[model samples]
Target: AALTRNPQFQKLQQWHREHGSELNLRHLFDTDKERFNHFSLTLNTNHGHILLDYSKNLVTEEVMHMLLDLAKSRGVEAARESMFNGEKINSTEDRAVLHVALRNRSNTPIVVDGKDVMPEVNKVLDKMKAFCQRVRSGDWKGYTGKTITDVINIGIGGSDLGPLMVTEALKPYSSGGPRVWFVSNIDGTHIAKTLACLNPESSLFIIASKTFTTQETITNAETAKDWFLLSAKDPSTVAKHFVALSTNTAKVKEFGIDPQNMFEFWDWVGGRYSLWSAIGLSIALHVGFDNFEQLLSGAHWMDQHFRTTPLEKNAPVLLAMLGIWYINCFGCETQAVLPYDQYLHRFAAYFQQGDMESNGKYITKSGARVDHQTGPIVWGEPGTNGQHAFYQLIHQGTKMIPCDFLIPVQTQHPIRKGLHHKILLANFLAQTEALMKGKSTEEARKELQAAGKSPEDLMKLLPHKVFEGNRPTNSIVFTKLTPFILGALIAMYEHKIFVQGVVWDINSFDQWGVELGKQLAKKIEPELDGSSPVTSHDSSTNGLINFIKQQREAKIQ
Candidate 1:
């Protein structure tokens, strides 16, 4: 049945319309001092402590129950079980969702199609460890017999974002490892500028495309290879410097990467979730294999938590429900994922693709247009930077933007003996608190009157200062940002994306929407090269093509 047609959904809609008094954070805290204690949940793990404080959201105890009931009605538990059990839950692609298996540190057997995939998973792990140790210890040499000093990661989309974010996050742990660089854009300048600073003889390149045929990644890889050949006389020398994280052995070998250096992952591992697989070769290489294993262990811990915990106590489930409550019922069009730590500047951008690409759909499982909103626009910047930027709109603008504030109790970089972190943490706590408990009109008037402003001045500024304080936000507190915690944080959101997809009756794994642009780009490339006329395109595309051609003609003259 369609979700809106469900009786529980109708009741939820009615409840959202006119059930409780207008929620005020100050009043709620005053009336119930234990609101934080009652509403928040903490998950204890070997790596660190995680707290989810959702007390300030508009949801009441009853609304929380309704939200859980909505998940029950939609069979979220069954879907979750299917995914963990390695069933073919990704119906569009007929593949099992097994990124969890990639990080199963226990070496437990997860059978898919009457075969245990654990051995294969461990095999790749061993390979990644040996290779990383060789390179990090200076045992491996580049084409010119120089120990590698720099690493270039060439891939696009999931291939680039996950490894780049992980390497940057864990860079502090690097011990004389090769300095890593990533090039994802097909633009020549991206490759040109990156190669400009590095010695070709001291650089190793990892080409990370599952198919080895993504246009942007292949083009950039070819450019890098060409640049390397300029310094190294032998074409076979490419084998010494270039490795591949791809299953296409023939293509990898054809591109001059030795087949022995080709790390492989199965189709069951989606690109976005492939970091735990050999796709994380760059991560394992950047941080030592031990730190990479810690990352895997951290994710496995979250997997266990998500699997064993009941719906109400489940972190991912609660996140999905709260998001559904805002997006479907409260009519929120966007959600902000603001991490307080500077290391996580790209974290929100990573999930922007993780959440948006997965759930940004109009068609339901039943092949009908959804009667309600599906996904919120996921966006944010690191805390203090965002405070200076679009936070004003979140505070005063009419749109209801649900925010997730992530803060760590400890600091990774303690400048001036922890003073900077405390100040950063102060802003972190204050932002959420202020968002929930905004200044009332009475408070604004008292401030203006205390300043000795005239009545006319007070009247003019009163409306501007008065804030409607019922904004919803979730505060996620962590003990510290370690490798394991980073893994847990990422896996928690991955499962949240999965749960929301299940509740919304949409397929989260397969991205059919991304294919259309690639198909069009193939057709348009010839037109842009001046080899074909752009007649079949729409008026806008035709006009743009002519404009580009004219510009190119001017440049030629």
Candidate 2:
């Protein structure tokens, strides 16, 4: 049954229609001092503490119960169990959803289609570790005998976002590792500018396409090779400068990368969920393999937590439910993920792909169009920076924005005797608190009166200053941001997205929406060669194509 048709969902709609506006955060907290205890959850791990305080959101115990009941009625537990057991849950693709196998960490036997995937997974890990050691230890040198100082990972979408985000986030763990750059955009400037500052001898490029056939990735890879050969020699040296994270050995070998140098991931690994597989070779190379293992272990820890814990106490499950409440019940069209750390600047951008790509579908698993909202627009910038930007609209605009604020308890760099981080922490706390308890009419009136304004001026200004706070937000406070913690955080959101997809009756693993654009682009490319004034497209597309061709012709002359 569709989620909207569920009994619990019907009850929720009735509840919200009757009492939604009364879910004021200020009133709720004032009525129950233990709201935090009832609504929040914490995870105590060997790495450190991960506190998920969700008490500030607009939800009651009864609402939470209905949401929990909705989760069970939707069979989220069964769907989760199917994913862990390696069943073929991705019906559209007829493949197992097993990125979880990539970080199994425990070496448990997970049989998919009657074969244990562990040995193959462990083999890939071993190979990646060996290659990482060779590069980082300087045992692998360029044709000129100089050690690699930089690596350029070339891929698009999942191949690009995860590694780029992780490498940037955990750069503190990269003292002995090579500096890294990523090129995903097919525009020549992306590769050209990156290589301009890097030496061909010191740069190693990892081509990260799964099939070695993605147009953008392969074009970028060829461009990178052309630049490399400008300073490098023939086929032999190309192998030294280039490697592949792909399963197509014929293509890899034909392209001059040695088969032994090619890393392989699986078919079940969706492009968005692929970083845990061999697509993370760049991540392993940028950070040490041990740190990569910590990342995997952290993810494995989260996997265990989500798999075993009951729905009521589950962090990911709770997150999914709250998101459902906002997106479905409250008509929220967007959600923001604001990380307080500078290193985590790309965190939200990464999940923009992670969350949006996974859940941005309208069709159900049964192939019917959804009757309700499926996914919110997930976006945000790192904190304090956003405090200056679109945050005004978030705070004062007519639209209500649900935000998740993540921060570390400890600072990575304690500069100025911890004053900077202290100030940052203060802002982090202040933003959430202010959003939850905005200035009342009386409070605004008092401020105007205290400014010594006359009666007319005070009356005019008081309404402008008034704020009705009761905005929803979640605060994720962790001890520190390590590889383990980063991995855990990413996995938590992955599970959250999965649970929501289950309730929404969508196949989050499949991304058919991206295909139409790719197909149209392929059709449009050959027509853009200034080839005798083409006009097959619709009027608007035809006009745009001719305009670009005219521009290119003018430049050529």
Candidate 3:
């Protein structure tokens, strides 16, 4: 379990200790030619599944093996075993991290809290299946006897983002079912815009906060309720119109939803991880349960992979340890996830929450603040757009950013002309290739000369056309963007986050960092409505309020 001895990480450390006293990346490129080939990995399932072509990174071959060795040294195997065994690896909350077990569609026996959790998981899934069947068959009617045409999910954070991302990503699988709309923002504008389109009778509202008390979710829910009551006029109709995904049955009842209509999950399922549990109701309602089950099955495959695979080749373990190598050891501050497909535009947003909200903690379980850099700043847009926009910073900026470039060999939305898939795949492949094999001025000049540019024209264009390309990126190519593949993609990152947290020794399940913002918002909201002057006053808040009051007074005059 000694990380320093891991050959890959050791070589990286050795390289850094020998040459990285100041940590300049320019030298690595100058010295290495096959760096990308040495750094990246590709995985496939041979059933319409492929993982990555990760060879376009800054690390040397010796360093890649060194990092993979670090994963073995760090006991990722034992940690993975602990998760599969249903032990309490989430040290902060004393709960088992078992969202993976929810998707154990085999009805396999899994336990939590001295009882079999799989049975309960299956029961809840059966309930969901029955409920979904009723709705999809038009047997479940709203207050006015209209079939539910729309489902508005009312929640924030995990409740909103997970289902929203999947429903959008798999829009091709949508079978003329209910249109799923999400209202997670506290801003009145979000709910107002969504409510403007629908009849209350045909819209089914899913109140999805785990506590049933999240301010943004509750406010929007109550506003939607007000809109519903205006049309239905009978308070009893509320029970039929609204359902909740929460464990707090008493509060759900208070919110006018029947307890039977309330779906429940446990403390073991973290908010961000609850998409496999009842939180995926919107996804099921949109894409049908069968496809949702396929999504789960795909994730379950990776769960088994991470649980059982050797650390050397384990996708998640390799990703996690290398992240530590770059972030903590080599001083990379930001990581980029640039998927080449337009369909995955929100992939970054999805993982931003997955990574940032999970491990974005300062203090650890022992109340000790971690001294090492933990999670890097995760950001990216769709590839061609990013190639136009921030690729400049990535190429020439002083910072070292290791990017993941994703694309599929077969595009579902193939344009079929002008190099279509070939050019897309070429650029996807070439970007990673170019990043690792960056062109020097000499190389650029030679290329321009081959293109027959006059030496005078070359001199004039050199400053603008020169690309200092030794940047690092990992290109991921899939066969197609199918439901099963998206499932594997999500599971890959989920396991990646898990391994990163294991190495950092931080609990990725709990989000203590978010409580402060929630507490601050409550204090400021009353002052905004003028019901109370802001207490615990800071000068900035006082100045803002005074400005607003003066503006209001002028308006009244």
Best by TM-score: 2
The per-model lDDT (C-alpha) reads 0.89, 0.92, 0.79
Output the lDDT of residue 147, model 1.
95
* TM-score per candidate, chains pooled: 0.97, 0.98, 0.91
lDDT tens digits by residue: candidate 3, 1-557 = 23333455556666777755543245665566664455545666655757555554555556666676666666677887788778998887788988888888666777877898998887777788788888877888988798989889999888888898888888888885789999989889999999999988888899997888877898999999999999999999999889998888888999899889888888888888888889998888898989888889888877777776777667777777667877868788888898887878888888988998888866655666676677888888987888989777776677788888888777776666636778777777777766656677887888889999998999997766667665756667777787777887888899999888776667888877777887887777677765334446788877777677657657452
Task: Report the C-alpha lDDT of model 2 over 96-131, residue by residue, as the tens digit.
Answer: 999999999999999987899999999999999999
Deviation (Å) of 241 in candidate 3:
1.8
Candidate 1 TM-score, true structure as reference = 0.97
- Which structure among the candidates has the greatest lDDT? 2
Question: What order do candidates take by lDDT, descending?
Answer: 2, 1, 3
User: What lDDT score is found at residue 280 in candidate 2?
Assistant: 91
Residue clash pairs of candidate 1 = none
Give per-residue CA lDDT, model 1, range 1-557, as digits (tens).
37888787788888888864466667878798788887899999956899999898887788889998988898888988899889988887889999999999987888999999999999999998999988989999887688999988999888988998888878787877889999999999999999998898889999999999888999999989999998897899998899999989999999999999999899899888888999898898888899999999999999999989998889999999999988888788888999987888899988998898888987777787888889889999998999899999999998889999998898878879999999999999999888888998999999999999999999999999988877889999999988999999999999999988888888888888988898888888777876344677899999888877777757452
> Which consecutive 10 residues in model 2 have the weakest lDDT in total?
548-557
Model 1 C-alpha RMSD to native? 1.6
Off by over 4 Å in 3: 1-14, 19-42, 415-420, 447-460, 529-536, 552-557
Clashing pairs in 2: none
